[PDB]
């Protein structure tokens, strides 16, 4: 079986977080992220993976992944995937992409399916040596059942918004 147990709207990163160092990529590791091991409860052989989609405009590229734009001065590299941040899939474009190939829980057991979203800031332009970014809608992640598993009457999609932050130049 499957049931939705998480939240529809999720914030990425600590609000008002500040990060210090073209394009220039800020090393923020996993600090600007959202992670929740338990978004769907699954059991008895349910098989599920994850699809992700970024709605921000693509303003460039870096090593194969899109630089998504927030402001004329700030962009973002974005990853979406299974719970642990190391499993993140680098996002490109604006279409649904497979960000977690999936797994099946046991026939006689139960567990949960989670997810993570992580971004790293990119300075596109310079300017009081500071860059502010308002709360911004990023995109979404939808569970992707397989092997005959069914979404049934369950919420399949959750959204993500980037919490406001400040970059120090
Ligand atoms: C740690 C936990 O409670 N549940 C994890 C879940 O977050 C993850 O999506 C899934 C597939 O890797 O594996 C479960 O064990």
CATH code for the domain of 99: 2.60.40.1410
Which residues partner with 161 through β-bridges? Answer: 11, 137
- Which string of b and e fits 10-30 if b means at least 16 CB within 10 Å? bbbbeeeeebeeeeebbebee
Nearest CA-CA partner of 24 in 124, 133, 128, 132: 124
- Ligand 1 mean position, distance from CA 38 (Å): 7
Number of structural domains (the chain) is 1
Q: Which atom of ligand 1 is nearest to the CA of 113?
A: 9
Q: Within 6 Å (CB) of ligand 1, which residues are found? A: 37-38, 82-83, 103, 111-114
**Structure obtained using:** X-ray
The structure was resolved to a resolution in Å of 1.6
Q: Which atom of ligand 1 is nearest to the CA of 103?
A: 11
The DSSP string of the chain is -EEE-S-SEEEES-TTEEEE---EE---TTSSEEEEEEEEEEETT-EEEEEEEE-SPEEEEETTEEEEESSSSEEEEEEEESSSGGG-EE--SSS-EEEEEEEE--TT-EEEEEEEEEEEEEE-S----EEEE--EEEEEEEEEEETT---TTS--EEEEEEPPEEEE-
Is 126 in contact with 88 (CB distance < 8 Å)?
no
Print the domain residue range for 10.
1-169
CA distance 50 to 68: 21
Maximum Cα interatomic distance, the chain, rounded to a whole number of Å: 59
């Amino acid at each position: 079986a499957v049931s939705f147990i998480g939240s529809t709207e999720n914030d990425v990163g600590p609000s008002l977080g500040s990060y210090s160092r073209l394009p220039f990529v800020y090393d923020t590791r996993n600090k600007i992220g959202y992670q929740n091991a338990n978004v769907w409860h699954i059991s008895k052989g349910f098989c599920v993976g994850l699809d992700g989609k970024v709605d921000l405009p693509v303003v460039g590229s870096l090593d194969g992944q899109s630089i998504y734009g927030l402001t004329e001065e700030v962009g973002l590299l974005i990853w979406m995937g299974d719970t642990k941040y190391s499993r993140g899939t680098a996002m490109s474009g604006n279409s649904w992409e497979n960000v977690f190939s999936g797994w099946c829980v046991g026939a006689n057991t139960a567990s949960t399916q989670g997810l993570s979203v992580r971004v790293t800031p990119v300075i596109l332009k310079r300017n009081s040596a500071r860059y502010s970014v308002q709360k911004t809608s990023i995109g979404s992640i939808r569970m992707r059942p397989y092997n005959g598993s069914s979404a049934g009457s369950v919420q399949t999609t959750v959204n993500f918004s980037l919490n406001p932050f400040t970059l120090n130049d």
